[PDB]
Design a protein around this motif. Sequence first.
Motif, short mmCIF file in Angstrom:
data_model
loop_
_atom_site.label_atom_id
_atom_site.label_comp_id
_atom_site.label_asym_id
_atom_site.label_seq_id
_atom_site.Cartn_x
_atom_site.Cartn_y
_atom_site.Cartn_z
N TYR A 23 0.84 -1.20 0.00
CA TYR A 23 0.00 0.00 0.00
C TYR A 23 0.87 1.24 0.00
O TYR A 23 1.56 1.52 0.99
N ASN A 27 -2.25 5.95 0.04
CA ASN A 27 -3.38 5.20 0.59
C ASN A 27 -3.56 5.48 2.06
O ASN A 27 -4.69 5.63 2.54
N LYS A 116 -9.93 3.74 -2.22
CA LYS A 116 -9.70 2.62 -3.11
C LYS A 116 -10.11 2.97 -4.53
O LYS A 116 -11.23 3.42 -4.78
#
Length: 129
Positions: A23, A27, A116
């Motif tokens: 990630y 994020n 996302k």
Amino acid sequence: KVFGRCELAAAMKRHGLDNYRGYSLGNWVCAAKFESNFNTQATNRNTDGSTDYGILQINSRWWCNDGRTPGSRNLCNIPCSALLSSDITASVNCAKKIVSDGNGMNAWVAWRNRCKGTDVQAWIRGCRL
């Protein structure tokens, strides 16, 4: 403490979150923005009686002990109040265990619904990193 965007990005990067379990840094900054508006003191009570704590809104049903979530679990082995500190170390260390749990960053509802699949790199653009 209410972090600035780039200030938090740099703090998370120092604590090893950039590309943690794949990630990218953006994020994590995006998740913190929509979970807590970058406020380490954020708390929110859930319908099941558990409470979410801190900049990443870590839940007392599984991850920390707040003395009032009966039958809950304390997987990060910390009092939930430790997640409200201006020092994000405890939140980051606990987040690393959450994101390793099998469900990735989908454990954070705001990440799944608002980060996302978006251009999350925008959250660290312009920062000196």
